[PDB]
Amino acid sequence: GIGKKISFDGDFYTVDGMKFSKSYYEKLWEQGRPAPFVQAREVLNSNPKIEPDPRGAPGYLRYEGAGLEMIYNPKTGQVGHIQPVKV
Amino acid sequence: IGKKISFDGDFYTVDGMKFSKSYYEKLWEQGRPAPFVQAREVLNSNPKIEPDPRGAPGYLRYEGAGLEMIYNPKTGQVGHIQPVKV
Amino acid sequence: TKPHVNVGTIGHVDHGKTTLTAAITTVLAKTYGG
Amino acid sequence: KPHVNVGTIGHVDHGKTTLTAAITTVLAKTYGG
Amino acid sequence: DIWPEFQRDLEMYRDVVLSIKRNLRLYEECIESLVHQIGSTNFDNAQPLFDDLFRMQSELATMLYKYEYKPGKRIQDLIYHLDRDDFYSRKYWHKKFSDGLAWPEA
Amino acid sequence: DIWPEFQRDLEMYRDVVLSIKRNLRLYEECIESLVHQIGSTNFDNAQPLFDDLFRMQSELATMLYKYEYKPGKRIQDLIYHLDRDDFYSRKYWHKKFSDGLAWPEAG
Amino acid sequence: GITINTSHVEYDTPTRHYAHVDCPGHADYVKNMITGAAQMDGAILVVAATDGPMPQTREHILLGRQVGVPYIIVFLNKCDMVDDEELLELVEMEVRELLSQYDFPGDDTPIVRGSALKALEGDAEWEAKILELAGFLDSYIPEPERAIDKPFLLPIEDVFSISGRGTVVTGRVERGIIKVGEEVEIVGIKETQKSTCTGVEMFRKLLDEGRAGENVGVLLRGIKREEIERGQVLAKPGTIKPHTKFESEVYILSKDEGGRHTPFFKGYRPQFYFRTTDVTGTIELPEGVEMVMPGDNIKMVVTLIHPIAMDDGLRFAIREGGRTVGAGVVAKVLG
Amino acid sequence: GITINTSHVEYDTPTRHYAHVDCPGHADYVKNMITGAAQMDGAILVVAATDGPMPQTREHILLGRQVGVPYIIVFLNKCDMVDDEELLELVEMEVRELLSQYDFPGDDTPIVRGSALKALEGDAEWEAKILELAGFLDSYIPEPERAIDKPFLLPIEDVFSISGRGTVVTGRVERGIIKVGEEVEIVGIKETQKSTCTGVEMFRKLLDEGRAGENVGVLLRGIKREEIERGQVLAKPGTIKPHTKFESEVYILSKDEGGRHTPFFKGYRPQFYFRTTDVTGTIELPEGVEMVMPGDNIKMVVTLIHPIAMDDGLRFAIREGGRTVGAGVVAKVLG
Ligand SMILES: Nc1nc2c(ncn2[C@@H]2O[C@H](COP(=O)(O)OP(=O)(O)O)[C@@H](O)[C@H]2O)c(=O)[nH]1
C-alpha cells in the first residue's frame, strides 16, 4: 500500500519483517541485483518450495519461487542469500 | 603446388573453377575469405547435388562441407556459396 | 529554512552589469543585514 | 638494382644536413651525370 | 589484478551492444517496408528496391561474418534467405512478396 | 544511412569481446589454481584463499548481471555455485575440493 | 573540459536568499545560459539610458527565450548621466518593444530607473532604486517549482529480469514520486508502452515508494527484458513524449576546451547524449551559416535517428568519438 | 597522430640505389629510429673534427644498438678547419672507443676524413672523400635480407570456421612462404599448437601457396574456432616464441601529437599493441627516473599479462583508452 520506511541499526536493513545485513544489502545493489526486498517478497509470495538449508546454517531454510532461490530465517526474518535459479 | 589464379577482366579462374570479379571480391570483403578453397571443399565432400531451386540455366545446387553452392559444372562458375542455414 | 533563488545579470558591454551586481549586495547588506 | 635504406646520425651542427646534400650532389655529377 | 580494465571493457561492451540492437531494429523495420513495396509493384520498377534490399542484407552479412555479431533469429534467417542476389532469386522473391509474404521464409 | 557508424560500433564490439574472452581465460585459470590450493590445505589457512575466490566470483557475477555479458557454461556454473559465501558454504566447498573436486559442480 | 569564468555574489532580502551569477565576457554569459552551473529562475537585464539597447541586449534576450529563462526584470541604468524624463520614457518604450518580440510580457515587465554606480558609492537617493529592484525580485520572480513537486520521471540505467513476475528497472529519479500500483509509460527509442509498478524500492530508505533523489528500483509487471532498454524513461502517463526533431541552442567547445580543432559543416553527424544514452543525429545550420567554428554558439535544428523522451529545456551534450565537443539545450520540440 | 619531419634524398652508386633519411631535430632522429618509415640497413655517423664526439653522438650510437641498426660508418667532418694529422688520429681513437662500448666493431669501422661543405660547394679535393664514403656504403653495408627469404610468419586477423574440414585464418603474410601441406605453429596468448595447412589462397594470385605481401587465407585441419584467435601468429615451427617480458626503447607522444597531457609513473598499466592486438602490461622505469614526460624517449622493461609472439626489432604501439600514447621497439626479449 503506502511507503514503509527501511530501518538501519548499524548492522541490518529491516522492513516488513525482512532483513538483510548491511554489506549483503549493499553488495546486491552494487552487483546489478537491485531491490532485494522486492525480490525476497516475491519469493515469499510465490508459494515457494521450502526445504532445510542444504548447507545446514542454523535457523535457515531454502525457499524457491519466482525464479529465485533464497536462504531465509523465518524466525529472524533475515535473508542470508538470494540469487536466480541455475540456468 | 602453387596454381596461378587468372583474371580476364570478368572472372577469376583456377583449377577449373571460376568466380565473377565482383562476387569474388565481395566474399573476401565480407569476411568469407578463400572462396576457391571453400568451393573445392564442397566439390570434394561427396556433395548432395540437385537442380538449382531458382532455375538459373546450367546451374545446380551442391551441399557439403557445411556449405551450399550454386555451381555450373559445364563452365566451372560458382554463382553463389554460403554456409548452410543455422 | 529561507527560500533559495538563482538570478543573474544580462545585457550589453559597459552598461553596468558588474557594477549593479556589486551595488545590490552592498545595499541589501547595509539595509536588511544580508 | 639493389635497394638500400641508410641514414645520417650524430650531434647538432656537425654537418648531417650538409653531408646528406653533398652525397646526392657528387654521385649525381660522377655516376650517370 | 585485471578487474579495473575488465570493468572498462564490460561497460564498453554494454554500450556498444545496446547501440547495435537499436541499429538492428531500424534495419528490421526498413526491410519490412521494402519487402512491402516490392510486393506492391511490378518487376522492372522493383529493381532499385531490390538493390537497396540486398545492399542491406550484405551489410548484415558483414556484421555476422566479419565482426561476428550474432543477431536475433529473424535477422539470421534473413541473412541466409537473401544472400543470393541475381535475376533468378529476384524473380522468386518478387513473386513470393507479391503473393503476400511479409518477411523472407522458406 | 546508419552503416558507417554501425561498422564503427561493430569493430568496437569485435575488439572488446576478444579482450573480455581473454580476461575470462585468466579468471578460469586462476580459479582452477585456487580451488587446487584450497583442497590441499587446512580450513583455517584456506580462509584468505576463499576470500580471493569469492571476490573473483563477485566480479564475475557483476559482469553477468550488471553489464550483461553472458560467459561460457563453465563460468556460468561457477557464478551460480559460488555465489553464496559464508562459513557454511566454505565448510562444504573445502570438503569437496579436499576430496578432489577441481571445479565447482552440483552435489 | 569546458571552462566558464563566473562571479558568485550572494545577498538577502528580508524574505528570500538570492544567489547572483554575473560573468565577465560576452562569451561567458552564453556558456553559462546554455550549460549553467545553476538555471536562472529570473534575470536582470541592464540597459544604459545613455546608449539605449545595443546588439548584445538583443542576443541575451533571445537566448533567454531559447534557453527558457522564465522572467526578466529591467534595471535602466546610468540615469544620473541623463536629465530629461521624456528621453527615458522613450528608451523604456524601446526596451519593452524588444522584450515583446521574444515573448516576454514587455508591457507588464518591471523597469527600475537607477544608477548602480551612485548606489555602490553610497548615495541615498539612488540606493532606494536598488531596494526598489529587490522589491521586484521578491514580487515578480516566483520560487521555482521543486523537483519532487513535478510529474514523475526516471531515466532507465539498468534492467534486471525476474522470471514469472516482470522486470526491475533502476535509475535515479529526476522528479516526482512513484508509488506501487501507479501506471507508468516507458518512453523513447521504441514505441511507447504502459505498465503498472508492482514493487518499488528506494535504496536504503523506502519500500513501495520512491522520491526524486536516490536510486530507485521499479518492478514492472508483464514487461520482459527485451522490451525495455537503458536510455528510455519511466514517466507518469501523458507527461512526456518521444521526439526525433528539435530546435536547439548549442555551444561548440573550443580546441583549448578539449573540443574540435576544425569547424564543421552541414553534413556533421555527431552523437547527442540525453540523460543516460547517446543517439546519432543530423543537423540543419541556420540561413547563410555554412560552418560552425570551434568556440561558437549557434542555433541548430537536430533530427535524431531514434526518438528520445524530451521537453523544452532538456540539456544535452554533443559528442564525437567519446569526446565532448558541445553542449546544448532543447529550445523547441518539433516532432 | 605522431608527427615526424624528415628529408628523403635518393642517390645512386654505380652498383646500388640508396634511400637516405635525414632529420632536422634531435627529437626527430629519435622518433624516426624507433618508428621509422623505413628501417635503416646502415647508418652514417657524423662527428666534427672541430668538436670531437658530444652528448648526442653517444645517444644516437646507443639507440643504434637498442633499435638494431646493423652497421655504422663514420664521416669525420669539418676537416678543412683542422690542419694537424695527429689531432685527427686522436679524435678517431675516441670515436672507435665510443662505438666499441655499444658493441659496434670500432677497430674495423670505416672512417672517412672529409669536408661535407667544401664537397657540396664543388671542391674536387674534398669530393673524392664523398666518393670514398659511398665506396664504404657499397662495401661495408650488405643488402638486407628480403622479407620473402625469411621464416614464414602470418599475424592472424580473422577466423572463419568451415564445418567438418577445419578453420580458415586470414591475414597479411609478414615474411616467408606457406605451401599446402606444411606444418605450422600457432603462437601467442595460448599455449603453442601445431597444425597442417590443408589449403591456402593468396587473394587474386595463388591457390595452395602464399607469399609475403597480399592477404592469405589458410585452412588448418582439425583446428576449431575457439582454439585460435586474432593476435596470434602462424609460423614455421620453431622460428618464433611467445614471451611476456622484454626491454624496450619507447617514445612517448607529446600532448600536441595527441598523446598524454601529464607524465606517468612506475604504476602505469597501458595497453601494448603488437601486430593485430593490444595486451595490458606493467613497466619498470630505469634507475633514478621517477616519471616520463609526454614527449620523452625512455628505455623501459615491460611485462605483458599474456604472451605474444616476438623477436628483437618488433615494433609496437602504446595505447590508453583507444588512443596512441607511445611507440616502441623490442630491444631484448627476456622470457
Ligand atoms: N555615471 C555612471 N556610470 C556608470 C553607472 N553604472 C556603470 N557606470 C560606469 O560603467 C563602467 C563600466 O561598467 P561595468 O560595471 O563594467 O559594466 P559591464 O561592462 O556590463 O560589466 C564603469 O567604469 C562605471 O563607471 C551609473 O549608474 N552611472
Ligand SMILES: Nc1nc2c(ncn2[C@@H]2O[C@H](COP(=O)(O)OP(=O)(O)O)[C@@H](O)[C@H]2O)c(=O)[nH]1
Ligand atoms: N667548415 C665546415 N663547416 C661545416 C661543414 N658542414 C657543415 N658545416 C657548418 O655547419 C652548419 C650547419 O650544418 P648542418 O648541415 O645543419 O649540420 P646538422 O645540424 O648536423 O644538420 C653550416 O652553417 C656550416 O657552416 C664542413 O664540412 N666544414
